[PDB]
Each structure stands twice: as C-alpha cells, then as structure tokens.
Design a protein around this ligand. Structure first.
Ligand SMILES: O[C@@H]1CNC[C@H]1n1cc(COc2cncc(Br)c2)nn1
Length: 330
C-alpha cells in the first residue's frame, strides 16, 4: 500500500505545517502537525478542557463506532520548547491520504498548554519519530508509521515541505519526479529515539565549505535551524547589523538586509538553504528588526535540522531494519 497527502504552511512564515488526517467511523478529519521529532499521535478532543480549546477541530470518540477506550492508559508529554499536553487513550481507525491503519492509538487531550490553545490551525500532532519515545503509560503504543510499515510497498516515508507553498508527505514510495539529482543517504542513530544523523559541515553564502561533524536530528516539528554557537555566529557575521539579542532570545537582523544562503553537508552532497528561508519577519508587528531562522542550539542541548533546513530538500525517512536518512535537492 501507499499514501499521499498535501501539507500546508499554517501561516505566512512557515511556522509549522498541517496535513489532513481521517480519524474514526464516520471519518472525522483533523489537521495534524506531522512531527518527526516526537512519537505520540494526540488530538484536541471533546474531552479537552473547554477554556483550552480556541478554534481547533476536535475528535469526539463517542461519535466514532470504531473507537475503543484503552483501559487504564494515559499519556503526558513535555516538549523541548516548553509546551505540553496530556490525556487518555483510544484506539481507532486512522487514514492519511489513502493509507489506512486500524487500531491506531489516538491520544485524546484533556489538557494542553497555552501555545497549543493559541494556535487554532493545529488540531493535534502525528508523531513520526521512533516508537521508543511514545509516552503512553503503563503500556507504550506504536506510531502510525510503525503500524503501517509492514503493509507499505517500501518501509519509508518522505517529507517535501514547501517554502510559502504546499508540499507533500508520501508513505511507502519515493516520488522520483519530486527532486533533482540523486538522493544521498546517511547513517541514523536511534539511541535517543530521533532521526539522528551527522552532517559533514557547512558553508555561509558563497564562502568556503567547512568540514566538521554536526550531530543533529531531522525534525519536521521544529520551525528553525538550531546549530552550534560557532556555526551560528559565523552565519550572522555575514549579515550587516545582525546581533544576538538577549531580550528577544536569539539573533535578529535589520529587515532590509539581504540574507546569505546557508549550505549543509550530507556526506559529499550539499543542500543549499536560500537566504530568504532564514527570514522570519518583524520581531513584533510594525518593527524593522527581524527574527533570524538560524539560532544557537546551546540552550536546547541538541542540534535540530528543523523546517528551515528540511524544506530546502526532499527528505527520505527510511524505516528499514537499519534506518537511514536521505536528502536530495529539489
Ligand atoms: O511538535 C513539537 C511540539 N511543539 C513543536 C515541536 N517541538 C520541538 C521541540 C524541540 O525543542 C525545541 C524546538 N524549537 C524551539 C525550542 Br526553544 C525548543 N519541542 N517541541
């Protein structure tokens, strides 16, 4: 089997991407944040505290004839960006663009933190990291990709995120018309439960490529590109007037600047992030100071190839017995 679904930026800054997902019988369609950095499928629901719902589409398990409460199972997640959610668990049928999984764990939110409430465009998350990170207790549950994997034509899914434009998540096949050149594959460590790999280095604009190992994760759920302080300083030094602002919490730059590109290495291959992918607009409405899309990972403790980097590539998440990661230009 295969599946294919369009993914859409939630706003003009590509802060996140939503993909429609069918849950239950009859189908309840929710727009979920496909997240290769976490491993829980959780949704706003009829059980979510009313004051914490503000525009989201909710899943109502009592109206799904295939929904079954998973007795005694709860979940609770604390994300690296400080957000959180928790609730109970149902099993139900879940479909993504023609691909169907029965008995998927659908984690129903009773509580969500303010950042989720304030974002009316995201109805929940669909985790695509490794199932060892799933938070359901006392019995851990499997991700949608894990449940579907054996039935797929190939045990793979691909992320093709657009810059200010629609994109595609494919399951079970590689669309060879969706990229240029060849796909370069690179080793993955699953020891932290992430799609964790080692970049071979970087370049700023037309500058010389710096060969240096950068261990990080491919995370569609993170907006920005988080890299070591030495690398991020080298990038923003090429933007006149850019500086790290302690009050804003990162590098900012004059909105009138033309940003240089940023290149990262995948083996001997090179992925080029155009300069305007790194512009995240005024720090506050009406300001002429703009927020940078490349930031230091020093506070986070891990390097994150988030949407800023991944949307410059066609990205293969290869879930074979030994998983690997593939990158192509597009
Ligand atoms: O789908 C998850 C919940 N919200 C977005 C995703 N997520 C990613 C992380 C990783 O850590 C950080 C990422 N970006 C900024 C900071 Br400050 C920390 N935590 N949450």
């Amino acid at each position: 089997s295969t599946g294919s679904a369009t993914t859409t930026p939630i706003d003009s800054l590509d802060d996140a991407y939503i993909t429609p997902v069918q849950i239950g019988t009859p189908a309840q369609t929710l727009n979920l944040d496909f997240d290769t950095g976490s491993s829980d499928l959780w949704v706003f629901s009829s059980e979510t505290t009313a004051s914490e719902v503000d525009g989201q589409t909710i899943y109502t398990p009592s109206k799904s004839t295939t929904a079954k409460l998973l007795s005694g199972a709860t979940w609770s997640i604390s994300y690296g960006d400080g957000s959180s959610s928790s609730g109970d668990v149902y099993t139900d049928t879940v479909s993504v663009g023609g691909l169907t999984v029965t008995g998927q764990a659908v984690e129903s939110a009773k509580k969500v933190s303010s950042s989720f409430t304030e974002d009316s465009t995201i109805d929940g998350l669909l985790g695509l990291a490794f199932s060892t990170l799933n938070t359901v207790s006392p019995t851990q549950q499997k991700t949608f990709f894990d449940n579907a994997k054996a039935s797929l034509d190939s045990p793979v899914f691909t992320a093709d995120l657009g810059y200010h434009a629609p994109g595609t998540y494919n399951f079970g096949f590689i669309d060879t018309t969706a990229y240029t050149g060849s796909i370069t594959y690179t080793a993955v460590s699953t020891k932290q439960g992430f799609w964790e790999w080692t970049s071979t280095g970087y370049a700023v604009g037309s500058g010389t490529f710096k060969s240096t190992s950068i261990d990080g994760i491919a995370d569609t759920g993170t907006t920005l590109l988080y890299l070591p302080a030495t690398v991020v300083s080298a990038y923003w030094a090429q933007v006149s007037g850019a500086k790290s602002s302690s009050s804003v919490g990162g590098y900012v730059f004059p909105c009138s600047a033309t940003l240089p590109s940023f290149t990262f290495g995948v083996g001997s291959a090179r992925i080029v992030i155009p300069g305007d992918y790194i512009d995240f607009g005024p720090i506050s409405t009406g300001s002429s100071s703009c927020f940078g899309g490349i930031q230091s990972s020093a506070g986070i403790g891990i390097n994150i190839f988030g949407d800023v980097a991944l949307k410059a590539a066609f990205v293969v998440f290869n879930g074979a017995t030994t998983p690997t990661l593939g990158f192509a230009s597009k």
